[PDB]
Design an enzyme around this catalytic site. Structure first.
Site, PDB file in Angstrom:
ATOM      1  CB  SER A 102      -1.214  -0.138   1.194  1.00  0.00           C
ATOM      2  OG  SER A 102      -2.052   0.896   1.105  1.00  0.00           O
ATOM      3  CG  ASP A 162      -3.599  -3.876  -3.477  1.00  0.00           C
ATOM      4  OD1 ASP A 162      -3.764  -3.845  -4.679  1.00  0.00           O
ATOM      5  OD2 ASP A 162      -4.625  -3.942  -2.762  1.00  0.00           O
ATOM      6  CG  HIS A 202      -5.624  -2.045   0.115  1.00  0.00           C
ATOM      7  ND1 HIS A 202      -4.588  -2.070  -0.742  1.00  0.00           N
ATOM      8  CD2 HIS A 202      -5.325  -1.178   1.123  1.00  0.00           C
ATOM      9  CE1 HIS A 202      -3.841  -1.084  -0.383  1.00  0.00           C
ATOM     10  NE2 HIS A 202      -4.018  -0.576   0.391  1.00  0.00           N
TER      11      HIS A 202
HETATM   12 CL   LIG Z   1     -10.049  -3.156  -0.945  1.00  0.00          CL
END
Ligand SMILES: [Cl-]
Ligand SMILES: Cc1ccccc1-c1cc(C(=O)c2nccs2)ccc1C
Ligand SMILES: [Cl-]
Length: 371
Positions: free
Chosen positions: A219, A242, A297
């Site tokens: 992230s 991600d 996520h």
């Molecule tokens: Cl998500």
């Protein structure tokens, strides 16, 4: 339960803080361990992490106390302070956490990498992107263990661009600084851990395969991978899990010579973010992208193993895919990628087809259309 590693090595875990200040390095180390009969590692080790987590989730700090009640005794399957497995030089991963996270919350990844013969240094960032972190004001405070806590910073709308970019740059610097710390320990440079823990750092002497270095992150940590690579050529490849691309400066995109792998979840990604990933591409550059079908996520974080299936799906900690199935795909495709670009002599090439997204639970490239 956070899953045990799938590799042949037993896994140890310890913490390292050097120096003791807000400018020092704080990391959680996962490593191939000699022994397998230690106590398991406490997953979230301090009440103040739950306070910070509660602040980040937008609840009263007293919900922090309830999270502490539910999760405060949870462990992760790594042998706390186990001796390092001797007689082998290990490649090194530096790992960068997401917004609201901190060093301890990607142990499913860290343990699995270590079980395959990696040393993993999961950095705790002091950029106020962690829900909480701590350090010591000075040497006296460090000696008596008088912790100073630093909590997540919330931004106003017009601080977003500027502060997120300041944070990603601090994060990159912290990844470089953590690398240099481990590399200096690998020499045998005496380092006095600011934390008083029964793990001798002298074990790490001659233990690092000094050219086999990668940076991985989730992230915000995925942006940190890219920033880190563009500024520190000691990192030979990066894996962005991600990635949230928003923090990155306009300047970085054409400045990433190293191989870069994007492993994405299905449900997080959006065109503005995918467009930014595609700006990292050039014909002379090695780039790969896969999407894990039915994933969210937080499938990359330990929060995905922390609850049941119904609560998990409700809190967006789990997707339609099984969490173990999803993390196995991300970790195995990561292993094959690291074997290729670090030039490892292991059997990780058995997962080469996952790098191309060739699996029932993988999408080659992205599901997101950018037209
Ligand atoms: Cl998500
Ligand atoms: C699952 C969990 C365990 C112990 C402390 C907090 C959580 C939690 C975590 C998130 C989350 O998505 C994140 N938190 C930090 C970064 S992402 C969302 C909901 C909950 C209940
Ligand atoms: Cl968008």
């Amino acid at each position: 339960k956070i899953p045990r590693g799938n590799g042949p090595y037993s896994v140890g875990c310890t913490d390292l803080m050097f120096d003791h200040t807000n400018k020092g390095t704080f990391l959680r180390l996962y490593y191939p361990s000699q022994d397998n009969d230690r106590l398991d590692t406490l997953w979230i080790p301090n009440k103040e992490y739950f306070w910070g987590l509660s602040k980040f989730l937008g609840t009263h700090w007293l919900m922090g106390n309830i999270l502490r009640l539910l999760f405060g005794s949870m462990t992760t399957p790594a042998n706390w302070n186990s001796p390092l497995r001797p007689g082998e030089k290990y490649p090194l991963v530096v790992f960068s956490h997401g917004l609201g996270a901190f060093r301890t919350l990607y142990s499913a990844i860290g343990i699995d990498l270590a079980s395959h013969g990696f040393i993993v240094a999961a950095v705790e960032h002091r950029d106020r992107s962690a829900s909480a972190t701590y350090y010591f004001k000075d040497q006296s405070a460090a000696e008596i263990g008088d912790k100073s806590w630093l909590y997540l910073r919330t931004l106003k709308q017009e601080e977003e661009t500027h502060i997120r970019n300041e944070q990603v740059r601090q994060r990159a610097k912290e990844c470089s600084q953590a690398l240099s710390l481990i590399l200096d320990i690998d020499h045998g440079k005496p380092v006095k851990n600011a934390l008083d823990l029964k793990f001798d750092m002298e074990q790490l002497k001659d233990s690092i395969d000094r050219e086999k270095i990668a940076v991985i992150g989730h992230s915000f940590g995925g942006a940190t991978v890219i920033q880190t690579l563009s500024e520190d050529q000691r990192f030979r490849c990066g894996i962005a899990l991600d990635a949230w691309m928003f923090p990155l400066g306009d300047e970085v995109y054409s400045r990433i010579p190293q191989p870069l792998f994007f492993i994405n979840s299905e449900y997080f990604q959006y065109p503005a973010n995918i467009i930014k990933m595609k700006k990292c591409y050039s014909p002379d550059k090695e780039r790969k992208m896969i999407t894990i079908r039915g994933s969210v996520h937080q499938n990359f974080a330990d929060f995905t193993f922390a609850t049941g299936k119904i609560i998990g799906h409700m809190l967006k900690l789990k997707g339609d895919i099984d969490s173990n199935v999803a993390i196995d795909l991300s970790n195995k495709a990561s292993l094959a990628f690291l074997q290729k670009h670090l030039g490892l002599h292991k059997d990780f090439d058995q997962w080469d087809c996952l790098i191309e997204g060739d699996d029932e639970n993988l999408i080659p490239g992205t599901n997101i259309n950018t037209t």
